[PDB]
């Protein structure tokens, strides 16, 4: 069984949330799996959701396709998307995200570096 690394909620705006989950498979110490999960507890759907991510060049990032681009209102089906990070040199993980989507007929563009990444995700 893999180490139990706590989830990290990284974003909340008008009922839309983004959460990170982390898995460090013991059989491959250089690998970190991050699953992003977008949820929506507001009264309006999220559409055209795209999450872009960047890591320091000391690390490698791979993005899987997301489960979808819509998060229905009132706790609808979440979007999940897998990030594969390879970090053999145990460099400090830094992660910058760019979220773009439509919500309440507004174009949303949010960009930020993720703070409070658990050290277990890279040590």
């Amino acid at each position: 069984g893999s180490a139990p690394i706590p989830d990290l909620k990284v974003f909340e705006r008008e009922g839309v949330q983004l959460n990170l989950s982390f898995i460090r498979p013991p059989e491959n110490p250089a690998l970190l799996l991050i699953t992003i999960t977008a949820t929506n507890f507001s009264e309006g759907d999220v559409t055209h959701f795209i999450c872009q991510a960047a890591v320091p060049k000391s690390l490698q990032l791979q993005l899987q396709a997301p489960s979808g681009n819509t998060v229905p209102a009132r706790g609808g089906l979440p979007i999940t998307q897998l990030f594969r990070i390879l970090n053999p040199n145990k460099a400090p993980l830094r992660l910058k995200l760019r979220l773009t989507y439509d919500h309440f007929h507004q174009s949303v563009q949010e960009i930020f570096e993720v703070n409070n990444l658990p050290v277990e995700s890279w040590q």
């Binding site: 872009q52 991510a53 320091p56 060049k57 460099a91 910058k96």
Partner: peptide
């Protein structure tokens, strides 16, 4: 170490 948005 530099980054990139793809």
């Amino acid at each position: 170490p530099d980054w990139d948005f793809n």
